[PDB]
Amino acid sequence: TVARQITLLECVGKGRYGEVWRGSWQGENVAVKIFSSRDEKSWFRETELYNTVMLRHENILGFIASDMTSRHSSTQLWLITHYHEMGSLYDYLQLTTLDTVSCLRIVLSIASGLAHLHIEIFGTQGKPAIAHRDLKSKNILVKKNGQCCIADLGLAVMHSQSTNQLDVGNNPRVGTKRYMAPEVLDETIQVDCFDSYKRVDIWAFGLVLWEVARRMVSNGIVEDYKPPFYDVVPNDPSFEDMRKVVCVDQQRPNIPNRWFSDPTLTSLAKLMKECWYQNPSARLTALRIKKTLTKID
Numbered sequence: 001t002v003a004r005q006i007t008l009l010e011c012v013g014k015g016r017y018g019e020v021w022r023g024s025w026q027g028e029n030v031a032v033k034i035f036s037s038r039d040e041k042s043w044f045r046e047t048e049l050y051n052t053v054m055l056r057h058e059n060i061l062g063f064i065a066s067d068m069t070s071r072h073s074s075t076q077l078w079l080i081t082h083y084h085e086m087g088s089l090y091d092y093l094q095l096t097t098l099d100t101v102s103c104l105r106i107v108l109s110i111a112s113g114l115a116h117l118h119i120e121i122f123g124t125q126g127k128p129a130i131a132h133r134d135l136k137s138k139n140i141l142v143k144k145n146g147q148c149c150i151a152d153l154g155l156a157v158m159h160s161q162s163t164n165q166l167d168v169g170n171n172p173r174v175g176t177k178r179y180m181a182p183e184v185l186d187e188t189i190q191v192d193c194f195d196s197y198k199r200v201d202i203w204a205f206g207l208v209l210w211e212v213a214r215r216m217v218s219n220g221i222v223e224d225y226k227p228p229f230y231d232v233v234p235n236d237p238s239f240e241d242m243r244k245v246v247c248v249d250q251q252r253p254n255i256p257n258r259w260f261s262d263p264t265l266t267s268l269a270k271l272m273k274e275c276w277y278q279n280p281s282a283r284l285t286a287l288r289i290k291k292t293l294t295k296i297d
């Protein structure tokens with residue numbers, strides 16, 4: 001169903017993943033992702049997660065439907081979700097700066113969505129723990145109320161007390177290299193250990209925090225948008241570029257001096273560094289981050 005009722009109006013994204021369209025379903029905007037063949041298995045994993053898990057949370061992208069539809073003499077794989085007209089956090093941050101409240105609301109809402117993903121709730125009305133594995137600004141959408149929701153669950157891995165085996169391939173280097181945690185890049189991560197995947201999300205969250213904080217204005221000062229590690233790796237960095245910086249040199253994004261003139265950015269700088277520990281077990285939990293951000297307000 002639904003695929004029939006949907007008219008595609010304008011393509012708002014196109015890449016190796018496929019395309020994302022603004023469509024109309026009974027006159028209502030929906031986001032339609034048409035997967036590339038390359039990413040067909042992500043469509044299935046994401047579809048099955050959303051269809052089997054009650055994953056309704058204000059800070060997780062709202063699923064509507066999935067469909068298989070043959071159109072251009074070939075089958076199309078569609079994922080249909082709520083449409084967030086503001087688009088991705090990545091693109092939003094390049095258009096505007098943030099005051100203190102808008103910055104906190106963004107980062108807290110991401111922490112809230114990530115904590116909800118991570119938490120296992122027993123039973124019906126509950127949910128397995130979920131690790132995202134590709135958290136970054138391009139996979140986060142901004143809402144008009146200034147909160148964000150986390151998107152793109154095609155690499156996510158789930159865990160509950162039902163089974164010890166995880167639906168993860170043998171290759172741990174699945175995400176976006178620029179955001180890959182050190183234990184992924186050097187491939188020492190314990191693929192058997194679900195908690196290890198949560199900690200990889202926390203590392204990436206720290207990087208997103210840094211990206212956002214750079215755009216918060218303090219005393220008329222603000223940084224331009226940059227991706228993590230812009231100053232030391234080329235675009236489309238290689239595994240080796242990333243490993244030398246992050247694993248061998250053990251470098252991190254630098255904190256602009258101006259942040260320490262503002263107590264919010266001072267607090268956030270402290271927080272992102274607690275997300276970036278080389279040792280995964282020292283990193284704050286998602287819920288700890290959320291509780292901390294609830295108080296920094």
Ligand SMILES: CNC(=O)[C@H]1C[C@H](n2c(-c3cc(OC)c(OC)c(OC)c3)nc3ccc(C(=O)NCC4CCN(C)CC4)cc32)C1
Pocket residue numbers: 012013014020031032033061079080081083084085086087088091095138139140141151152153
């Ligand atoms: C890696 N970047 C991407 O993919 C791109 C396309 C993704 N996009 C998703 C989306 C949908 C999904 O499924 C259906 C996904 O997968 C679950 C998903 O994953 C991240 C994202 N909804 C969107 C809603 C709107 C827009 C958008 O830009 N409109 C244009 C206006 C923006 C603001 N003014 C300044 C300019 C014009 C873009 C959206 C982001």
